[PDB]
């Protein structure tokens, strides 16, 4: 889902978990009750650690991403942070959707749509992701359980296929695609296959 304002995001997540890993519902901490301006990440952590309830939260203007926002939330003896993302039209969101393929994967699909004995074309075309802008895709591949570092290359965010060449027959390769949001971060979670040409 997407939100027209930070408040819309907040109120939605008072009733629907902000986390994919635990059930975390936002509640006000015990000034504005939840927007704390350019509060440093470390100070936010200290403040939230002194709250009684899991889900105690604030939103802050990020220092590392100027002009953008972060959501900080108490859960047990930890504080979790969520980067507030923007789409092409300024709407805010935290998590990418897609009603097909593998749940919680971005892109949601990764198929080998064509292959020769030494090459292949991977495709994530069937991902329903026009609402989720990608900066660039990063593709990595290498011998499964290999010694060497993986090979990597990138393609523009408009792409929905990628060529991998020079593969040796009978060798298992692990292929992973990361969908960039900007020039630093990818959307969770990447999609990955193992394939033997």
């Amino acid at each position: 889902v997407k939100f027209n304002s930070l408040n819309e995001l907040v109120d939605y997540h008072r009733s629907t978990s902000v986390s994919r890993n635990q059930q975390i519902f936002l509640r006000d901490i015990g000034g504005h009750p939840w927007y704390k301006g350019k509060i440093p990440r470390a100070k936010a952590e200290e403040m939230l650690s002194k709250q009684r309830h899991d889900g105690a939260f604030l939103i802050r203007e990020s220092e590392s991403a100027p002009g953008d926002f972060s959501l900080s939330v108490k859960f047990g003896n930890d504080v979790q942070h969520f980067k507030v993302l923007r789409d092409g039209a300024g709407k805010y969101f935290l998590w990418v959707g897609g009603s097909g393929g593998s749940v919680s994967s971005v892109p949601t699909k990764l198929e080998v749509v064509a292959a020769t004995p030494t090459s292949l074309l991977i495709s994530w075309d069937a991902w329903s992701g026009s609402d989720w802008p990608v900066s660039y895709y990063r593709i990595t591949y290498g011998e499964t359980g290999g010694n060497s570092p993986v090979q990597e290359f990138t393609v523009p965010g408009s792409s929905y296929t990628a060529t991998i060449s020079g593969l040796s027959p009978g060798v298992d390769y692990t292929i992973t695609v990361y969908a960039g949001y900007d020039g630093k971060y990818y959307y969770q979670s990447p999609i990955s296959i193992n394939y033997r040409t």
């Binding site: 994919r20 972060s70 980067k83 998590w95 990361y178 630093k184 969770q188 979670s189």
Partner: peptide
Amino acid sequence: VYENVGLM
């Protein structure tokens, strides 16, 4: 660093 994004 954040729960919903990873570092490239």
